[PDB]
Amino acid sequence: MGSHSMRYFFTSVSRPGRGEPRFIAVGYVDDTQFVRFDSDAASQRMEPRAPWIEQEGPEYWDGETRKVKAHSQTHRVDLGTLRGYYNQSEAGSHTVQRMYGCDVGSDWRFLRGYHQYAYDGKDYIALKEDLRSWTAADMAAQTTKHKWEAAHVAEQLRAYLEGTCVEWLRRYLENGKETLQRTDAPKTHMTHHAVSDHEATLRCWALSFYPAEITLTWQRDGEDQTQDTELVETRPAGDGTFQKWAAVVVPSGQEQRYTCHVQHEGLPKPLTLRWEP
Amino acid sequence: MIQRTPKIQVYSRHPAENGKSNFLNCYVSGFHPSDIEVDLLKNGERIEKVEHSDLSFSKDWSFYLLYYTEFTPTEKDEYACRVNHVTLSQPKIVKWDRDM
Amino acid sequence: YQFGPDFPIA
Ligand SMILES: [Br-]
């Protein structure tokens, strides 16, 4: 089928009043979370969050826990380092975020890798798409860049991202294929709400879809319209699928001129909805 | 520090129908820093059995969380999401509208 | 499967 991704997200938040940073790590295949670690949870282990990962054996869980704990310690250090680089007080809480991962394309081979790092919610340092060179946002990140160049960190990451990362992504995709390689096309419908005697709102709903990427667009007499429209952020249903809606306000009696167009990977051709009641 | 205030959507998992069990969702997104307080309310009172997703973030580094609880909607019960974050001078209450 | 054995400090 189409392209796929494996991504890991990490957040560390310093606690200057007492104790260690809060650290939360999540792993995804596409739009499906499959593992978590939370430093405040009781297990102190990497934990499963999808059924298809539960079959991995103890060597896997020990290794993932080992890696994620070490990562947490690296962020602990970084929080101290960066507070120094930025000449900040010991009094405040600060945040480190890292995301990394790999995509496979339509040919099921490596497509791209990424590794990005942020401090206090702003870019700090990122690996370029070539997986060979770094983008440093400021002179603090420049110091990190020189550290990481000297240590050949990009070479190490590139080897993972082109090899191990995509090999494990492909394993997960096969072992979880019943869901991970199922596309759930949006279940669509339109509702109608009078706003006055003269105008009505048409709302085009897309429900229970997976993956999350979707496009909803209104047309009037076959031409895209954005004026007098509203689009909500795509939102999780809680059962692993997503929802979205788009609405347009129209002159009452002219509803049939308007069409909602829905594009999604699960739809071989886009759907067109029209109020003709 | 960049501070970004949360966007809030309050919605059901399934189309709402009175008497039928469902899930009430409060999706908070676009915020920074991550510390946030979110309660679901029924007739202004805090729901105890509320769960949430594991913290993650978007392309722009901002955080998102889903908070949710089972519920069985009715004609006269009101539901809402209450959110506090360092960017809000008081908690923000967003009422559940079943058409949104 | 995470990158390992560890990330370098900043
Ligand atoms: Br604290």
Numbering used by the authors:
A (entry chain A): 0 to 276
B (entry chain B): 0 to 99
C (entry chain C): 1 to 10
Text of the article:
We demonstrated that the TCR from the 1E6 T cell clone bound to HLA-A*0201–ALWGPDPAAA using a limited footprint and very weak binding affinity. Here, we solved the structure of the 1E6 TCR with 7 altered peptide ligands (APLs) determined by our previously published combinatorial peptide library (CPL) screening, 2 of which mapped within human pathogens. Concomitant with our global analysis of 1E6 TCR binding to the APLs, we observed a common interaction element, consistent with our previous findings, that utilized TCR residues Tyr97α and Trp97β, forming an aromatic cap over a central GPD motif that was present in all of the APLs. Ligand engagement is dominated by peptide interactions, but hotspot-like interactions with the central GPD motif enable the 1E6 TCR to tolerate peptide residues that vary outside of this region, explaining how T cells expressing this TCR may cross-react with a large number of different peptides.
We also solved the structure of each unligated APL to investigate whether structural changes occurred before or after binding — which, combined with an in-depth cellular and biophysical analysis of the 1E6 interaction with each APL, demonstrated the molecular mechanism mediating the high level of cross-reactivity exhibited by this preproinsulin-reactive human CD8+ T cell clone. Competitive functional testing revealed that the preproinsulin-derived sequence ALWGPDPAAA was one of the least potent targets for 1E6, with only the MVWGPDPLYV and YLGGPDFPTI demonstrating a similar low-activity profile in MIP-1β secretion and target killing assays. Additional small movements in the Cα backbone of the peptide around peptide residue Asp6 were apparent in the A2-YLGGPDFPTI (KD = ~400 μM), A2-ALWGPDPAAA (KD = ~208 μM), and A2-RQFGPDWIVA (KD = 44.4 μM) structures. The weak binding affinity between 1E6 and A2-MVWGPDPLYV and A2-YLGGPDFPTI generated thermodynamic data that were not robust enough to gain insight into the enthalpic (ΔH°) and entropic (TΔS°) changes that contributed to the different binding affinities/potencies for each APL. The potential requirement for a larger degree of induced fit during binding to these weaker-affinity ligands is consistent with the larger entropic penalties observed for these interactions.
